[PDB]
Symmetry: D2
Subunit: 90 residues, 4 copies
């Protein structure tokens, strides 16, 4: 799973650039749920029936909105990653 493929797969199915607030609201919701999963100690790599409410799920759900926000804000995350590599060597 390439990171630019994740971003574009998410763009294929969930892209409403006139609803930028929707996506920011959702990011913050998922970070709240993540806080809860970490507080409860729901760590490790869940099977399918362990997934709901796990640190793993909430980590992914935050990632989803990172990517969804990137599409909305015209951000290429893979190209941004690369520029950060340049900064981190200089």
């Amino acid at each position: 799973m390439k990171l630019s493929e994740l971003q574009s797969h998410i763009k294929e199915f969930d892209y409403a650039p006139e609803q930028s607030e929707h996506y920011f609201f959702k990011l913050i919701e998922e970070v709240g749920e993540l806080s809860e999963s970490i507080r409860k100690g729901k760590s490790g790599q869940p099977t399918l029936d362990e997934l709901k409410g796990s640190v793993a799920e909430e980590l992914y759900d935050v990632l989803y909105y990172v990517c969804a926000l990137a599409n909305i804000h015209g951000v290429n995350l893979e190209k941004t990653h690369e520029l950060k590599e340049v900064l981190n060597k200089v």
Copy 2:
């Protein structure tokens, strides 16, 4: 950039499992910095000199701590992505 490779690269240069709070704190810091960037409308794909403060950089920095929390919490994001695919299709 493969997602597993990103997670694995971050773990090479930043992995302290006895400091789980460090990483959660840092996540919240970046989300606050991301919020500033969206508020200030610093959208688009920046060149190297436009990178500091950009929506692009803050989304990346948030991505970074999602991955680094995944490493700390024993989460495989790519495996978790696959599982979420299954639940979403149902």
Copy 3:
């Protein structure tokens, strides 16, 4: 609690949880002053819940919110 960092870490988790629930309630437009039967999930409840953990964190971190407000007011006029 009695070990201070565990208390702080708890209230900080809860702070982020409520800020999440507040985001949802703003998204859904659950504004105004609710009666009791509309309290759950309202913006009002979530704003109170966030306020609650702010205050809880101030107690544990040795913060006087009222004296902090006054210090901020000097900086403001300055």
Copy 4:
């Protein structure tokens, strides 16, 4: 200062999150206690107040009475 209310709410919500980010930093760094004026910048005290400030600003624009809400919550908890 703001005339269209969703725009005022959106601003205050962005600022609230910004301030929560800054509070996270002040806690990570252990900047606890009650500071004098020279120690206020970047302290836990400052960020707590700053978060408190936007909670209130957001309550004003959403038509929330925090005193009455607190009272309603107390009735619930007792139940």
